[PDB]
Write a protein that binds this ligand. Structure first.
Ligand SMILES: [Cl-]
Ligand SMILES: [Cl-]
Ligand SMILES: [Cl-]
Ligand SMILES: [Cl-]
Ligand SMILES: [Fe+3]
Ligand SMILES: [Fe+3]
Ligand SMILES: [Fe+3]
Ligand SMILES: [Fe+3]
Ligand SMILES: [Fe+3]
Ligand SMILES: [Fe+3]
Ligand SMILES: [Fe+3]
Ligand SMILES: [Fe+3]
Ligand SMILES: [Fe+3]
Ligand SMILES: [Fe+3]
Lengths: 178, 178, 178, 178
């Protein structure tokens, strides 16, 4: 029985480029988390309490996703390397602009996963593609959700009354098409 | 005991023009179903989740109506003839325009039933008029309902804020005058 | 943020050949639905009430599968294109012949999914392969189920007594090997 | 306020031909009742206990239908005239032959109602057509049911094993397509 780079018994070695890509993706998830925290603060500063609660929960969810990836590296007997985290964007001219950044952040999180997926396929790492499959599934739902929230906010066309209505939807937990 | 055209024991023969009219009406119900599916998709594409849920349910209801008619032909020992189904309309310039097509589709479904009803009366087919009576009753309620939804959407006069409010009514199941 | 062909925010563009293949597959699911409806009617005409109830439920299930695909296109910000639907087959010389068509229809539904799957792999569309994976899993179970029903009906070898016994199994919901 | 022929206050006079037709129809219902009793006895004599229980219940149901008609005449302030009742048929060569007589009896009961219906329409007696409407509805279901039982017995093709299976279905209350 061989020992992996993190010291645990090694079921199968992992290509170092794939390892680096997973460690980098963990940073992407952590950065999405602090970005959603920053968005929750922006909404709270404008009394958009429902949007604030939504993004506060998304920040915690994205952090959980990052930890889920750290656990996979542990399971593969690979080292984690928690990286410096950039400061998030913190200023937006409108809720519609913020929601566009949020949608792009969600799509970019999926692109990061897709990049890791392709590397695993090139290295025939079927454990990693299996691990990623349900995360891509979740990303489809999150992209559908964020397209819904962005599209609904854009439909409001900057009308405060419509934005108050949507804010109350989010406070109630009405955050998807259903 | 005679055998009917579908092979079962025949309680009373049915005029072939009336049979053809019922088979055609089943197509009308099936076409209303796929039309409501198309309308549900149009609403989902615009984040009108309550309208989407409403029309998704109406599509399933109209299909059930079609099956209800197929069961009547079985009960009368008559052959079913499931027909080619046209593609539905799929593009509208506004929710108000979509709701006008929906109302017209409901009224046209009733006109189809009325045409079958008149043919049954000309042929003294009292089983068929009795079968249709409760379906006409249901159509009165559906026409009242769709006039309500169309009228409420028109009252909104294209204001996104009012349409968001109505959308949430539909999501909650508030779809009739009550 | 770019807008997709259906107007929603676009997480990632989809190759038009893959889009066409998904729209065509939706037609396959809708056609399986109306085929199972036709089979349910054939069984009802012969007093095979358990087979009638089984195929009535399968028709509703296949329609749900089609709608599930329409929702995926919405989630990917792609246009739906609901197509003309052919009339189903409606005549069979025996229950065994009907069950053979049913098995073939289920296998052909899987082949359609497999064709879409291969196109997604050629286009590196990992969202689509992830979306399809559980549907292939369900198809394995449905193929196993339909091979079971077909094989059991063939074992009966046209004996009405055995077919009545199997009919009652289906009425009770005994439709798989278990 | 005028008094009707049975002595009660008269809401609206009834044409004597229509009255005679209703009194005759009551005899038809009573005759269906004793016919089903005779059929229940025939089945009991052959140990077909499920068929016996079914027809015993149908005999009681048909009697209830007759009483329902006597109550309508009371409600219309018309005289009842309970008539001599013929002896039922009591001999059949096979269960299939018995079931054919049963189906014909059910269809003939509907024809009797239809004859009364047409007379009421000629006399513009809307109370009577309204009274008869739900009874025709029930007849559609009974005709569907008896076509089901007859067709299933014919499918058995005289095989005692299949007839025992069907007998047990009836004992369990499985008497319709469902
Ligand atoms: Cl805004
Ligand atoms: Cl509008
Ligand atoms: Cl067979
Ligand atoms: Cl027999
Ligand atoms: Fe994440
Ligand atoms: Fe995310
Ligand atoms: Fe309908
Ligand atoms: Fe309708
Ligand atoms: Fe009525
Ligand atoms: Fe399917
Ligand atoms: Fe299938
Ligand atoms: Fe999977
Ligand atoms: Fe009766
Ligand atoms: Fe009867």
């Amino acid at each position: 029985v061989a020992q992996g780079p993190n010291g645990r018994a090694l079921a199968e070695s992992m290509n170092p480029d794939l390892l680096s890509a997973i460690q980098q993706h963990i940073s992407i998830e952590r950065y999405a988390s602090v970005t959603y925290l920053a968005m929750s603060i922006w909404c709270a500063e404008r009394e958009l309490a429902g949007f604030y609660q939504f993004f506060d929960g998304e920040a915690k969810a994205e952090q959980s996703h990052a930890v889920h990836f750290t656990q996979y590296l542990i399971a593969r007997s690979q080292s984690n390397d928690l990286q410096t985290l950039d400061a998030p964007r913190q200023n937006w001219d409108s809720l519609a602009s913020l929601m566009a950044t949020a949608f792009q952040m969600e799509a970019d999180t999926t692109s990061s996963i897709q990049s890791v997926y392709a590397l695993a396929e090139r290295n025939s790492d079927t454990r990693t593609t299996v691990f990623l499959d349900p995360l891509i599934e979740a990303q489809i739902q999150s992209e559908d959700q964020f397209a819904y929230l962005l599209g609904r906010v854009k439909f409001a066309n900057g009308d405060p009354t419509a934005l108050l209505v949507i804010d109350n939807e989010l406070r109630a937990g009405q955050t998807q098409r259903g």
